[PDB]
Structures are given as C-alpha cells and as structure tokens.
Write a protein that binds this ligand. Structure first.
Ligand code: HDD
Ligand code: HDD
Ligand SMILES: [Ca+2]
Ligand SMILES: [Ca+2]
Ligand SMILES: [Ca+2]
Lengths: 678, 678, 359
C-alpha cells in the first residue's frame, strides 16, 4: 500500500491551511459585523478556490464506474507459456485494483442502464504495472480504432439537446448500427441479459483482443483473456432495470461495496484460450478481428490464477476517479497483435490522461504508481512530485556512468516485441477481406441462447427500435437483422408495424457454442449476498416475531435480510415508503401481515398499494416469492399469484419454507412467467 | 440566432482536417493489409486526439441542466428606479439565454431528483452582459459563502464510495442540516413540491439575495428579483418522480425542448420587490440574510417585463455546457449588498471558469461574448482569439492618446458603486446577531401550505430521515424540526420509531403568507403542452377509430397526445412496452380496448399487466383518468377506481368527455386520493 | 526553484496585513497565478511548497490530488467525524487572527488617499543621499535610457517629472537628449539626507571572500607560470577565487584568453613574465587580437583594482595607458607585499576617481 503512505488522517487536530497554519473556515472577514467581505481574507479564498477546482473531466467513455482493491494469485509456474513475472510461480501474489463501468453514460448516470460494461484490472507486478482493460462482452462493435468516435458519437446523446442519457434507444445509434454491420455481434450481446447484469460480481470480463504470450526464448502463442465469475452469471429483466435506475442509481457500486464489507469479496478465475500463431485464420475467421470469439469447442480455457476483490477504496476521487488505465502498460512476456482496434487504443489511453489530469505526471498519482523503482530520464512537467538526483538525464552518457542502462530481451529483463512478428506489403488504408463476415457469429450467439433468452433479446430490440423515429433507419435496421436471422427480423418488425424483408440465408446456420447463455448456465453456485425482503407489519406482534425467526434462518446462510414495516423500530430495517421490489432478489410476506395487501389498504405512511405492489412486481419480474405462516391463500389471491407456480412458496414451517425458498434464490429467475412469440 | 456568425455547416462537402486538408477517417494506415498501424497516420491521430480531449470538468454545482435562447421585453421606462439600460424604455428588447438545473447531481443524473433548482439568466444588454444567477427557491441554506463547501460536501455522495447520487437522503446531509440550523428554511422548501417541479416551465426563479437598484442621481433602493411563471406552478409526487428518474432521466430538458419546438415557449414576468434602504431591518429580520423572504403582504411585486424562451440551442456543448454565468456580470443601475453569501459568490464564479475553460479567455466563447464592443487592456493568455491593434495597453498613456478612457458615474456610463454605501466597525469574522432566528420563517412557510401539501412535506422528511443510519443524527434532526413545529417533529418521529422531544414554542406562530403554496395556487392557467396518453388496441378497428377522434379534439386545444397500443402502425405513437404513466399528465382508455385490462391479459409484446398498470399508476399519482365510449365499468372495476371519483371521467360522447377531462388537466392533481395523518 | 510558489497569503499567527492598497491586491494575485503555473489546484502538495507540519482540512479532490483522505465527513459542522477538524482562532489552537484593533470607516470608494500625493520629496531625499559619483552614475543611467526613447513628447514629459525632483537632474539629463529642461519648480526641493541608501558611501566591503582575481600569464615563459602559481597560493589562502589565464590550458591554467573577459574578475593581475602579450603587434590564432591587453584595460576603466606582480611593471602599464601612481593600481616585486596591497583594493572594490563628473 503506496496508498497507505499517502493517507491523511483528520480524526484529531485543529483546522490548518494547506501550508500548515491553523485557521478557522466558518465566517468571512468583514469590514464591520454587517459589512462587505475583505479581499485580504486568505482563509476564504484558499477554501473556495479549492472547492471551485474540485472537478476534473470525466472519462470520454466509461465515465460511470466503481472500483476496489484486491489480489491476484497464480495457480502455477507459467514459464512454459509466458515470461510474465506475475505468473512465474505457484502461489505468487500480486496486488490488483479493478474498475467496473458502463460505456455511454456520464458520471451520475444510472448503473442499470442497458450497455456494454467495462472490467479494467491493474496488476501491480514486480516487473511493472500491467493493465488488462476489458469489457463484460467478448467482442467489440467495430474493426478499426479510427471509427471509435463515430461509434461513440452515435450512441451518446444527440448533440443539439443532449438527449437521451445512457441509452442506445434513439435514431443515431440504430443509424450507425444499421450502416456499420460489424456492430451486429456486440449489439446482440448488449441486447441480451449481458447488457443488464445483476451486478459487477455476476459478470465476466474479457480482454476482447487476441494478444501474445512470449516466452524468454522468444517463441509466442496467441491468447484471449477470460475472467470467469465465481459468483455465477445473472441478469436483471428490463422492466426491473428501468425502475432500479430511478430507485437506486448506485445499485452496482452499492452491491460491490457491501459484498466487500461483509467478507464476500467477489472472485474470478483468470483464464486464457491459447492457440498457435499458425491458427490465426484456422477457425473460419481472423484472430485479428475483435468482432469474433473463439468457440470454446475449438480452444478450451486454461485457468492461470485467482482474482479476488476484498477491500474498498478510502477516497473514491483519489483512487477510483484518478486510476488511469492503459493497454500500453504491458510487461515482459506479453505482446500485442495487429488487431487494428487494439493498435489505435495504444495511442488513445496515453493521450487522454493529459485531459483528465491536466498535466503529464499522471503516473505519479498514488493509485497509478508502480511498486518497483522507476529509473528514467523523464523530467519536469506540471505537477512534478520527484526531485531527480541524476543531473545527466540523457543517453548515451559518461557523466552518469551510462545509467540508466538499456533493457531488452538480453538485459535487465526488458520488454521486447515478439521476435517472430513481421509485416509485408503496401502501406494501405484498406480493410482485410478476412474481416467481412459480420453476421455468422451474431447468429451463433443467438442460436446458443434459451427460448426465453431469445425472447428477451427480441423484446430489447422491439423496445429500442420502436423509439427510433426515422422510418428509413427502422427499415435499414431490419435489413441488417434479417441477415443474422429472418425470425429475429420478423418478430422485431411485428412490434414496429413494418414488414421484414424476405429471408436471405447467406449467413444462416444452426450451430451453437457453450457458455454464452446466462439463463442456461444452471443455478447460481452461491446465494451469499442475495437480498431477501420480508414484508411485515407493526399491527400484529406475531408478524415481527415471524419476521425475526425467518431473519435468523436466512442470515445463517449469508443472505442479506431486510424486514420492511409501516414504521421503523427494533427488528425493522426499512419502511414501506422506501422499499421496492428492485431492492430484493426474493420477497416473503409473513402471514401476520395479510391485511396490508387488501385493495382498500391506505396509510399516510406509504403510497397506496405499496405492500402488494412490491410482491406483485417481484413475481412479475420472475423472482422467488412466498408467504410464510400457513394462512397463505389470501395474499396470493390479492396478488393473483398461483400457489402452485414454480418459484412461489407457501409453508407454515419456517425451516421447510427456507429450504425451498433458498433453492428458488439459486434458480434466481423463474422464466415460465414470461410470454413467448408463437 | 445571435450566434449564427459562429455556426459551421456540414450538410455538404468532403471531410477535411482542422486545417482544411481533404482526408478520410474510416480506416487506419497499416504496414500491409493485416499489418500494424503506422505512427505517420496523422488522420488517425488528429481525430482520436480530438475525441480523447472532448470532455471538460462539469460544473462544481448545478452540473445537470439545460438551456434555451429568448428575449426579454421591458414593460416601462424604469429610469425612475434604476439607470439599467435594458429597462430604460417601454418595449425595449434584449436577447437572453437561460439555463435551468438541479444542484447536487453530476451531469448524467436524473432531472427529477429532489433538489433545489437553478434558474440562471443572461441578459445581453446594450451596456454589457447582465446575469441573474437564481434558484427556484427564494432562500438559501447558509448565511456565509465560506460555508458553501461544507454544505455541498455534506449533500454530495459520501466520498469513500461516492454513494448516493443526486440525493440528500443520507447521514452526512442530515448531520449538516441538524448541526447548521440556518438550513431549516431552504430544507422545508426542498421537502415541499418545490423540490420536485413538474417542469422548468412550472417553477419560478429568484435572485435570493437583496440587491440594489441605483439611479443616475446615485440614490438606491433594495430589491429582490422574482421570475413568476406564466405557465403556473406544478409539482410531481415523490413516488412518480422516482419512477420518472429511471424511465426518463431527461424529462425536464425534453419538456423544455418540446415546448419551444411546438411554439409554446415558456414565459415569466420578471418582477422585483422594492424597499427603501431604511427598511433593511424593519420587517423583523435582516434583508442581508439570504435565509429570509420578504412576505408579499409587506412589499408587493412590481412587474418590470416579460422573459420568453423561444429558441433551442444548435449545439448543447458549445452553448449550454460552455455558458459561464457570474453575478460579477453586473451593469450600471444595479449594485450589490453586504449579504455575506452574495459577497463570496462574486469570487467563486470568476475563479471556477478557469477550471471549466482550462484558460483565462472564457469570455471569448460565442455564448459568453457581449453584443457590444470590448475596449480594455487585457492581453494574451491561453486561447487568445483577438488580435489587438493597440500596442500601448497601459493606463495612463499618451502613446495611445489616453485610450481607453476611464468610465465612472460621471463619464462613459460606467458602473459605479451606490455612493450611499458605507462600512463601519472592527474587522471581524463574526456572525451578525440579526441573523440568529433560523426557525420562524420555516414555520411561516409550513403554515402557508394546504393540509395535503403539509402531508407531502412530512412524507418527504419521513422518507429521507428513515434512510439515515445514525440514531444520533436522527435525534438531532428531530431537535431542529421541533423548534419549527412540534407537530412536524411528532409526525416525522412516528415513521422512524423515536419519540419527538417536548414542544419548545420559542419560534412557534400561526402567521401565513401568500403565494408559496403550489396546490393552493388554483387550477393551471393553461393546459397547452400537457400530455395525454390514450390507451388503445390494434385488436379492434373501432378502438383506433375512437383514439383518432379523441386525438383530433385534444390536439385542437394544444395538448400533446400519445396513442398507445400493442404495436406501432398509422395512428399509434408508442407501444405499451415503452409507455409509462410518468409519460402523461392524464390517461384515457378507449372502451374498445377493455380486454387488455383483464387480470389474465398477457402478450409477448409488453410486460404482464402493463396496460392496467399505466392506468392504476396515473390514478394513484392524482392524475385525471377516464374511459371514453360509454362502457367504462370493466376498466374502472379492474383498476379499482370509483366511477364517481373526482378526476375520474366516464362519457360516451367524445365532446363531453374532452370538455370535462380538460377541466381535470387544469386541476392537474386530485389531492383527495392521498391519506392524511390524523 | 522553478516550482516554488510564494504567496504573501502564507502568513502565520503573530503577523498581520495593513491597508496598503498595493499589498491588499497582491493577496489575491499570488493564489490565482499558481493555477496558471501548476495547471491545477494542488500546487501546495509539490515537495518545495509543502509545510513541515501536519495538514488538517476539508479541501478535497482537484487535478493532481496526491493525498488519500481518510475523513469521509469533510464538512463543518459535523458530528460524524466528532467535530474535527476543530476551528482555530485567537483563543484556541494557535489560530491566525486579524489584529483586533483594526477597524474601517466611511464610504465605499474608488478614490486615492490625499496622504499619498507627494511623489517627489523622497526621490529627492534618495538622490541627495548618494555620493557625487553615484549621482553621476544615476544621471548617466537616465541619459542612456531616455536617449533611446523615440517620442519627443514622451522625452519632454519625462523632464517635466524629473524636474519636480531636482532641477539639476533634469538639466544634466536634458543635455544628453538635446532638449532644454523646464524652469525649476521648487515645491518638493530640499537638502535632507538619510543614512544607508548609498552603495559607494557604505565603506570597504566587510569581506573579500569569494571575490574573483584573474591572473594574466603566458605559456611562453616558465617564469610567468611560476609567478602565477605563487600568486595563486597566496590569494587562495584569503578565500579569493583565482583564475589563471593563458594562451592554452595546461596544469595550473584555468582558462584561455579566448574565453576570458574583464567581466569575469573583480581584480586583474598581470605577471611580469607575461609582458610581451600586452604589445600592440601581439597576435595569435588562439585568441582575438589584443585580447590580453583588453582584459586589463577594461578592468581598469570599470574601476577595478589592477596590478603587475614581479617588479617590471612599466611596459604593461604604458601599453594600457594606466598611471603607476593611480589609486587601485599595484606594482610590487614581492608576492606578499603585492597581495597585502591588492586585497585592500578588492575591499575598496571600485576606484571611483576614474569616472568623469559633469561640470
Ligand atoms: C481509439 C479509442 C478507443 C478504442 C477503440 C477503445 N477505447 Fe477503451 N477507452 C478509450 C479509448 C478507446 C479512452 C478514451 O482512452 C478511455 C477513456 C478514459 C481512459 O482512461 O481511456 C477508454 C476507457 C476504457 C475503459 C475504462 C477504464 C477505467 O475504468 O478507467 C474500459 C474498460 C475500456 N475503455 C475498454 C475498451 C475495450 C474492451 C475496447 C475494445 C476492445 C475499447 N475500450 C476500445
Ligand atoms: C461560494 C460559492 C457559492 C455560493 C455561496 C453559491 N454558489 Fe452558485 N455556483 C458556484 C458557487 C457558489 C460555482 C462553483 O462558482 C458555480 C459552479 C459553476 C459555475 O459557473 O459556478 C455555481 C453555479 C450555480 C448555478 C448554475 C449556473 C449555470 O446554470 O451554469 C446557479 C443557478 C447557482 N450557482 C445559483 C446560486 C444561488 C441562487 C446561490 C445562493 C443564493 C448560490 N448559487 C450560492
Ligand atoms: Ca438520435
Ligand atoms: Ca490545463
Ligand atoms: Ca452519508
């Protein structure tokens, strides 16, 4: 913790200026008790000036996000495939910092927007900082970095009025998607449940690009990075995400914070797919193309180590806001590929930190510093924090005895470009013909989802495209969807009253791939941290008694339990007024409370119908719901919830109720409650 | 447009660099067709560098906002009270730019957060730019500018985890409120409907501070600025505001945008209260105190002129984002007072623009430029756009013949300090004792609300304080509330399971004041722009017929009509999937659509129960609802809405339906549907 | 050095400001200007600017933020951080406080105090307090600068102001620029003087340590370099910085004639073994024509102590047109006697009898 050396404690002591002079900061200096404020009030000005300059530009993308500290532990000595020092011994531990994010919204936008999500991991290795700046979706919208402002301008708010915030549901985005068909693969992922994850802990991370692992002998293999969640994969449903955006814009950052504080810090297996250089085009697409995945059937995952997040930042601004990641932060044993999206990224991340930091010495901020000595001839610049002793900062020199020395493949453990890499041909601004198949892999992805997942994706597209005003853009969108799947274009067209174009089967096929479905990936492996809302009443002393007994039983198994009542008191966490179904992964009514759910309910302490609305919403959104007490039928009738439904629980016995209700939590969503196209 | 001279047209022509060289920007230059990108690719780098640097720091407060162009027109020659040139002739027109905003949220946060709102107006006068940087609430939280960072730190997200976004519902804010009693007045306004306005058009603006009008003879009078909405006052209900925050984060900016495009540009009467210098302490409080209003019974409003917003910006960034308001932008005829809040603001706004603009020449941005010539000896600085001819930029000079000439009270129409102003006494960092009554005016305000408005305010406080984790903070909050009103403290305490402290009647009184109530300000004066959702179906050709007839008669009265059905087609604006009750001011079901409202209604095209939920939500939130066509009983029964309810409409005849329904839209909210504490 | 950011706003308990209107505005400027230099608000965190005591305040964020603040309730007043940091003032925490006797009275004005209006008496006090040669130098600095002003009207306006200080100054300055001085205006003329403002009159320097002595020698003569080495040891003993100069470097020789100039020395000594370099027909590809003699002559003309060490002085001094009996001109055979006299000269520092006076 270079973070702990820079920590500042203010738990005792008298207020000082920034130069250590004790002062006051509550009243301005004035000429007389009702007089004007004086220019000589240095206390006033130092304080306001600091306030007035507190903000810094938000990131150009991924502005909305949150971070945590942890550790990476290697499972083996990986010398045989990479020279990377953080992977060179069983059990070797490296500190990490991770930031998760959306792409499109500004700071302050809602966590539960539909979007691609960032998953950026810094490894503070003993041979330098290494960053993997990935996303929760393994493919990207575009095939060349020069198009990135085009993609981003199209998805961000229309620039006359700056509407809409954090959403692709507008003409410009679908105009771009429909004119730039490379977008189809990422679009399909973003329109699935991968666009609205349950939490940062319930998504995967991917490096997206093919990279190289380079051995000390100089041989190389091609790799893709996969961070596979140990919490399982899980999504919201859209109608739930929308309400969550309003009720709790901070949902994902709160979830992450709380999991870490409770001792449930999330984990991922850090994995690679590893293939030979000769396989760059063996799989029916080009490994230089970031719109393509390698099916796991062609290349299995190898598990390199464990990533665990287990500590929250001390100061959000200083750590999370100021962390400045770069794919250029590379270490010996890793190399780039000629992926034209990766290639341009290298430029952008060094440049953009000048905007954020306002000066060139951004690598000296505590969160950006390495954990090894720095020896170089970089000097001066605004905000220079070091006092360099070497007064001959040039190479070659004799007056500093030739130091710092050059590092390279054979000296000082230098980074070196993989020596088998070559280039040949004309200097061109031309797209490789090997990149031209934009529709096959979207179809592979779509084929690999379950029927209800396919319906959710169609429904997401129906939602967004129905909000596009241009009839031409809508037609063009159907044209592109039709090339992936005639069925998708037909079902989407039905919602927007246009006809789909005739089937064009060039890229149609029936193939599937493992591991891309959320709903298909079986029950969650753990239910720790999941949220249960127990709906109770201060009316009946039996209701708070039953709530307390359920609480014990659920908290035993690591669930986070919230007892809801009309008013706060001992045992009650939340009022009906502040409660919502978006707040819980499952809801239980204690039978003691059945009168609150009648249609003539009414209280000055919460909005009309709130108790029942929580229960109904939770049911309609596919959550496990139940009534505990043995007079269940009255609440279930008021809800129009069938007692015999999957994921509906009714028991008098607390112990039997809990046992089945917990199986429901693992199932997580009951997908039989959602209507499917015929 | 004033700013037409700076417009750039890209409706034709070939892509160029910033220096006019024709280029391409879709493919990177590579060493071979699958090769690495080249450093000599200047096309790539100039485009990506611009992208990398697009963002600028958000405003330190009022980051989330929106703007429009307009005109101010004077109603008279106001020479007899002020020298101000924009007020010197009946009918005199001056261009304006207004930005509206929330206070606490970052720039992507929801418009319908509970907050104080900004209302900042620039008058581009023939004697310089004059800015009135106001709020929609006439009193401010604190009495000294030096305390602003304390207020804002406490209300903004907790700095460890940056939670929660755009909300005072957390411990730090209520800690500050309870330890700093000056906050009570603004707190009561923010917890009333004024904290969740229906639109920027349905709120007032206030300068907050006492200022001075100064005549050409040097005599002065004390003024408060009031911008009084011609659209009337209106608020959301909290439970509505919360869902709206998710469903449409852009609600207020969209409402303003749309009103201007439809030729319904909003208007305010720009008014002043005018009192003599001798009345600074005549009204039982100190006019230098920004936590106090002057009750209209003691000083009436004088209408000075009309503010009309009628033109949307061309580019949001360039106009809205870059507008840099200053209370320091003052003109001859106006002066400051020794209000210690105002005094410190004068420093802050000049300083903070350096952060935003990144250099000192921010007054040269098109939106910030004046509409008259500039003559001064300000020179150089980053981003200097002028080429100054005068090569002797010093005073006094002979080598530029003594130009520019000094302007003052007697020459060149210079600004001048009101010459009757004086100071006397010790140089002190002390609060005037005349500022010490923090509680009477909060009580005056509370007393001037209707019973249901009082309930809504109590309920806002119950909501927020129930989320405060510290029992000590909650206790301290009740202590302060109790000094305003024992009844308030009792009613709030009931939701959080504490007892309120014994009554302390030092500041209790029964006085009321006119015009601070929303509910009490009679029906809206116009219903133009209000939104009616018509819930129809494609399953019956008669329903769409009914909807079309309803649309014709409602549009004739300038309402914005959305017809909602399962799918889009001619006549249908929105699908049930995208529709929500938060999108309408009133909801009509056409009786041809009754089958969608049954509890077994289901479709793959929208979430279960969505048609009925829209109707139920609208009813519960106090909106006029109805069924048109004659067969009303299944819809009203399914919704549990009584046919004889106020603001419930049931007529066979479209004519009669609309005549009654329109009375309901003017009534706006039916307050009898909300329960009151006994 | 480049990053140090000073401010008169950096004040401590026991010091306070006055209502000097120049000082009052400075307090604003120095806080504001560091934003320009540093490009962000955390300039007090640069090592040179940090205090040597703990910092406890609620300043947060900003570009370049180096601290990680633990207090997550950075507002006052608070209970959630127990009311810390506490307010410091006259009576608690050794706070800064404004001197309590200070007051203000009267109108809010943009007017100059009439008490500020005598612009000329003190300039005259200062001028009166200089020695005659110092007065001449001041006049000569004005004649130099004003003679480069192209505007005839500006020049007249200058003599109008100077004349209000001293008619004599305006006359002597006017003579160089071909204008007539305006007639005497004696409102602010006086004969008063004040101690300690004169440089020339502040006696010999109190130390000559660090002053620079150039020894002009030659590689022609093994004698010349021996004399230079003996001089060097004797001068270095008294903490002077000695530079031996010759045609080319070698052991004992610090600088070539090519790089040397009289501006590099406070005193110049020629060793008499080097006399041949000082002739008018001296010439070498290793230095500009006349360079050795020019160093000596420049040093003499600029008022420095000069001398010849070894016993044979008259060829050098005649080549240079320097009278052997001049004040601050030294001739001795003995190194010890040479240095004893020469060091008196270094303490005198400048021999002002070598500069002409008006009238
Ligand atoms: C040519 C520009 C460009 C391209 C093609 C990309 N990005 Fe990027 N990205 C940026 C330019 C950039 C940036 C403007 O440089 C950002 C904003 C702030 C920063 O540090 O870098 C950024 C931020 C950024 C962040 C946030 C890091 C954080 O939390 O601070 C993530 C996770 C990604 N990007 C991930 C990706 C992935 C997985 C991409 C494709 C595979 C990708 N970006 C393509
Ligand atoms: C001492 C500091 C301070 C104090 C006491 C206040 N403000 Fe302020 N205000 C600022 C410091 C500031 C600022 C940091 O200087 C901002 C942020 C951006 C800007 O241009 O100025 C600002 C912005 C800002 C804006 C946004 C203008 C726009 O849309 O760009 C409004 C409407 C206000 N303020 C209104 C007020 C009112 C009505 C106040 C009390 C009566 C008030 N402020 C007190
Ligand atoms: Ca658009
Ligand atoms: Ca800058
Ligand atoms: Ca808090």
């Amino acid at each position: 913790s270079p973070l702990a050396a820079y920590e500042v404690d203010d738990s005792t002591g008298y207020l000082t200026s920034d130069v250590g002079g004790p002062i006051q900061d509550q009243t301005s200096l004035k000429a007389g008790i009702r007089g004007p404020t004086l220019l000589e009030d240095f206390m006033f000005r130092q304080k306001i000036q600091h306030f007035d300059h507190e903000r810094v530009p938000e990131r150009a993308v991924h502005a909305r996000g949150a971070g945590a500290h942890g550790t990476f532990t290697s499972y083996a000595d990986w010398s045989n495939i990479t020279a990377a020092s953080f992977l060179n011994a069983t059990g070797k531990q490296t500190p990490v910092f991770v930031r998760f994010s959306t792409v499109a919204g500004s700071r302050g936008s809602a966590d539960t927007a539909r979007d691609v999500h960032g998953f950026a991991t810094r490894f503070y290795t003993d041979e330098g900082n290494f960053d993997i700046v990935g996303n929760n979706i393994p493919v990207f919208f575009i095939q060349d970095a020069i198009q990135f402002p085009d993609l981003i301008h199209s998805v961000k708010p229309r620039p006359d009025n700056e509407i809409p915030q954090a959403a692709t549901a507008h003409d410009s985005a679908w105009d771009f998607f429909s004119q730039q068909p490379s977008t189809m693969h990422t679009l399909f992922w973003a329109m699935s449940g991968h666009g609205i994850p349950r939490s940062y802990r319930h998504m995967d991370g991917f490096g997206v690009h093919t990279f190289r692992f380079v051995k000390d002998d100089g041989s190389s293999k091609l790799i893709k990075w996969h961070f596979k969640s140990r919490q399982g994969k899980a999504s919201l449903v859209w109608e739930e995400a929308q309400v969550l955006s309003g009720k709790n814009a901070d949902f994902h950052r709160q979830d992450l914070w709380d999991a870490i504080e409770s001792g449930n810090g999330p984990e991922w297996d850090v994995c690679v797919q590893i293939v030979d250089e000769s396989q760059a085009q063996a799989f029916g697409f080009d490994l230089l193309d970031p719109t393509k995945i390698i099916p796991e059937e062609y290349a299995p995952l190898t598990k390199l180590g464990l990533l665990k997040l287990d500590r929250n930042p001390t100061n959000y601004f200083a750590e999370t806001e100021q962390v400045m990641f770069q794919p250029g932060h590379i270490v010996r044993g890793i190399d780039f590929t000629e992926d034209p999206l990766l290639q341009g990224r290298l430029f952008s991340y060094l440049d953009t930190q000048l905007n954020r930091n306002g000066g060139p010495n951004f690598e000296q901020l505590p969160i950006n510093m390495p954990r090894v000595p720095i020896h170089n001839n970089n000097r001066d610049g605004a905000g220079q924090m070091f006092i360099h002793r070497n007064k001959y900062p040039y190479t070659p020199n004799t007056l500093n005895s030739g130091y710092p020395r050059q590092a390279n493949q054979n000296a000082g453990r230098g980074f070196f470009t993989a020596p088998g890499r070559t280039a040949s041909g004309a200097l061109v601004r031309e797209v490789s013909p090997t990149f031209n198949d934009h529709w096959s892999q979207p179809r592979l992805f779509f084929n690999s989802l379950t029927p209800v997942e396919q319906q959710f994706l169609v429904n997401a597209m129906r939602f967004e495209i129905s909000l596009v005003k241009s009839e031409e853009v809508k037609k063009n969108v159907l044209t592109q969807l039709n090339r992936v799947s005639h069925d998708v274009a037909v079902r989407v067209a039905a919602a927007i009253g246009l006809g789909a174009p005739d089937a064009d089967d060039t890229y149609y096929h029936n193939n599937k791939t493992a591991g891309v479905s959320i709903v298909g990936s079986g029950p969650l492996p753990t239910i720790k941290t999941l949220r249960v809302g127990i709906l109770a009443t201060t009316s009946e002393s039996s209701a708070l008694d039953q709530a307390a007994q359920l609480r014990t039983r659920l908290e035993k198994d690591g669930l986070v339990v919230t007892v809801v009542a009309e008013t706060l008191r001992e045992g009650v966490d939340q009022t009906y007024s502040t409660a919502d179904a978006t707040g819980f992964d499952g809801v239980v009514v204690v039978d003691g409370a059945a009168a609150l759910f009648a249609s003539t309910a009414s209280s000055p302490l919460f909005p009309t119908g709130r108790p029942l609305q929580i229960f109904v919403d939770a049911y309609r959104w596919g959550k496990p719901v139940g009534v505990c007490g043995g007079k269940s039928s009255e609440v279930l009738d008021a809800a129009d919830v069938p007692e015999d439904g999957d994921g509906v629980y009714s028991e008098e016995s607390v112990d039997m109720f809990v046992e089945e209700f917990e199986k429901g939590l693992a199932t997580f969503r009951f997908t039989d409650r959602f209507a499917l196209d015929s």
